[PDB]
Design goal:
The structure is a homotetramer.
Chain A: E1 9-11, E2 18-20, E3 27-28, E4 34-35, E5 39-42, E6 51-55, E7 84-85, E8 91-92, E9 96-98, H1 105-108, E10 109-111, E11 139-140, E12 146-147
Antiparallel strand pairs in A: 1-2, 3-4, 5-6, 7-8, 9-10, 11-12
Disulfide bonds (chains A, B, C, D): 1-9, 3-20, 23-32, 35-53, 56-70, 58-77, 80-89, 92-109, 112-126, 114-133, 135-144, 147-160
Subunit structure (chains A, B, C, D): Laminin is a complex glycoprotein, consisting of three different polypeptide chains (alpha, beta, gamma), which are bound to each other by disulfide bonds into a cross-shaped molecule comprising one long and three short arms with globules at each end.
Domain Laminin EGF-like (chains A, B, C, D): 1-55, 56-111, 112-162
């Protein structure tokens, strides 16, 4: 059998070709040349040096029971949860802010929720760490949703006036 | 239905009791009061404050396709792979050394392999970072497997002599 | 000069010995054979293979402005702050509980504060994750500080009685 | 003294204004309203909620002995070393590839070194994980520096020909 240590093989009938069957854990493919789902690397050096298959590294921000969580070759996370994003689920989705590495799911990424009347050009994204939205003149609040004390007419859509 | 948002329920016949069926993702149990496998927390505050279920945090040193990787309540990792160990797969098994957080599986934890003739009291464990074994007099090497230059008789089991 | 690339040296007068002076960043010592404070490794392979000096890895739980934060050879963290502890400031001090890796200093490690009247054998340590103290009969609360509903006399020091 | 617990203060002569002097560790400023260098947060809630000052979180890819390693308000890493980059020194500089989180400084980020004759449009950047450069027709190698077996003339600057 043209398969790694442990792998048994089978002569398929539907085309008459041999394929590996008990590929070592972490690898898959007809020759156990691919990494299994949930893993990434290049077990047989098919595309560069040999890279042992290892579990995806997505800062624990992926569903353990989902499939296709990461690119089997590069390790790029594909199914980041909790509104996280980035190559390794280490950023927040655009329009969100917080700390993707915060251990409690609720504290990872919260929506910017920028008030459209007070935010410059009605932007939907805010500072990624503080969440501060970019406010029009004399508007205040993280979401730019209220006028500064003594100013009025937020709905002017151009800042508050005295 | 006495179940969280989304969960449907079913009146079982075999005892005539209702149980939840479409528990929100991450939770499980007849009332979706437990965290699903691969997750940990306390969704309904059954044993302390409410703790949203989150994927186990085992420094990516657990098989994504195994079950029971961590304690569903505390998050303690139970099935650490690559010879890693510790509460969160952040140490190496006893008798191993290296860096459990090293990204390549081969560089995480290697066996001490202390030479029994040169190691003090025939110990099997070595320094967890350097891997240095504790050597008898005039013995050298990480594994204490050879005499210092000019000394002889390692098999004396008491160090080399001149 | 018997010193690495860049290092200049000086013939000291007080004993008449040469010593290196502009050791490359991260290293120190008369021959730049040690790693500088805040770093760990073995730049010249003086005690095993060459290990480039790198900043201590203490999960950001060390004072950036303190000295001696980690062992210059092994990297073992020595001055863990915020009540954190363990080889790499990845555990909580004994008698504390929480998540040493929690990003907010206040959420890392909190004191067990076990009530001495309700805790078994007056223990001071609690579960490292939940903080639950070990309670005597019919005593409840994380700190074991109150009787179960309908029980009395916590100060009995043996659990509450009906 | 208009200063936090522990801080003493001084009436300066050069303008006659009081300023705090023994600010609690991690904070600084005339009112201990700023986080000290090497730290980030908002101790007194001067720009949003109170955020305890904590050491910069730059994946240990910053010089412990440098100043201004991170933004005192947001925590954005400013002086990433070892060719690392990104908000938290968690990417590699452009034109580099590897794993910024690799514990050995040498394995973090290596230069793409794309061969200009074999790389498409003479690009200098390569795949961030594999380092593979984008090669012209019939050119091979990570750096696109040699022709496929049986092809010739790499210096054509358009791929090799048979």
């Amino acid at each position: 059998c043209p398969c790694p240590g442990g792998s048994s093989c089978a002569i398929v009938p539907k085309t008459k070709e041999v394929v590996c069957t008990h590929c070592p854990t972490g690898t898959a493919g007809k020759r156990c040349e691919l990494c299994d789902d949930g893993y990434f690397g290049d077990p047989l050096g098919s595309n560069g040096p040999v890279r042992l298959c290892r579990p995806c590294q997505c800062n624990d921000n992926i569903d353990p029971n989902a499939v296709g969580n990461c690119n089997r070759l590069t390790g790029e996370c594909l199914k980041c949860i909790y509104n996280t994003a980035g190559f390794y689920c280490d950023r927040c989705k655009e329009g969100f802010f917080g700390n993707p590495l915060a251990p409690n799911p609720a504290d990872k990424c919260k929506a910017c929720a920028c008030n459209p009347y007070g935010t410059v050009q009605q932007q939907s994204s805010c500072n990624p760490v503080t969440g501060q939205c970019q406010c029009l003149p004399h508007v205040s609040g993280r979401d730019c949703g209220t006028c500064d004390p003594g100013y009025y007419n937020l709905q002017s859509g151009q800042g508050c006036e005295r």
